[PDB]
């Protein structure tokens, strides 16, 4: 959701 961009690593 909004974490949705870290657990995306890179
Ligand atoms: C929001 O919509 C995504 C939330 C990010 C953390 C939990 C979702 C996990 C599903 C995405 C797979 C990413 C690698 C586990």
From Swiss-Prot:
Recorded consequence of changing residue 1 to A: Fails to associate with membranes
PTM field: GTP-bound form is myristoylated on Lys-2 by NMT1 and NMT2, allowing ARF6 to remain on membranes during the GTPase cycle, thereby promoting its activity. GDP-bound inactive form is demyristoylated on Lys-2 by SIRT2 at early endosomes or endocytic recycling compartment to allow its efficient activation by a guanine exchange factor (GEF) after GDP release.
Tissues/organs with expression: Ubiquitous, with higher levels in heart, substantia nigra, and kidney.
Subcellular location as annotated: Cytoplasm, Cytosol; Cell membrane; Endosome membrane; Recycling endosome membrane
Lipidation (N-myristoyl glycine): 1
Lipidation (N6-myristoyl lysine): 2
Quaternary structure annotation from Swiss-Prot or TrEMBL: Interacts (when activated) with GGA1, GGA2 and GGA3; the interaction is required for proper subcellular location of GGA1, GGA2 and GGA3. Interacts with PIP5K1C. Interacts with USP6 (via Rab-GAP TBC domain). Interacts with RAB11FIP3 and RAB11FIP4. Interacts with HERC1. Interacts with ARHGAP21. Interacts with ASAP3; the interaction is stabilized by calcium ions. Interacts with NCS1/FREQ at the plasma membrane. Interacts with TBC1D24. Interacts with ECPAS. Interacts with MICALL1. Interacts with SPAG9 homodimers, forming heterotetramers. Interacts with CYTH3. Interacts with ASAP2. (Microbial infection) Interacts with the V.cholerae enterotoxin subunit A1; this causes a conformation change so that the toxin can bind NAD and catalyze the ADP-ribosylation of Gs alpha.
Function text: GTP-binding protein involved in protein trafficking that regulates endocytic recycling and cytoskeleton remodeling. GTP-bound form plays an important role in the transport of multiple palmitoylated proteins form the Golgi to the plasma membrane. Required for normal completion of mitotic cytokinesis. Plays a role in the reorganization of the actin cytoskeleton and the formation of stress fibers. Involved in the regulation of dendritic spine development, contributing to the regulation of dendritic branching and filopodia extension.
Entry's family note: Belongs to the small GTPase superfamily. Arf family.
Name of the molecule in the record: ADP-ribosylation factor 6
Organism field: Homo sapiens (Human)
Originating gene: ARF6
Part of the full-length chain shown: 2 to 11 of 175
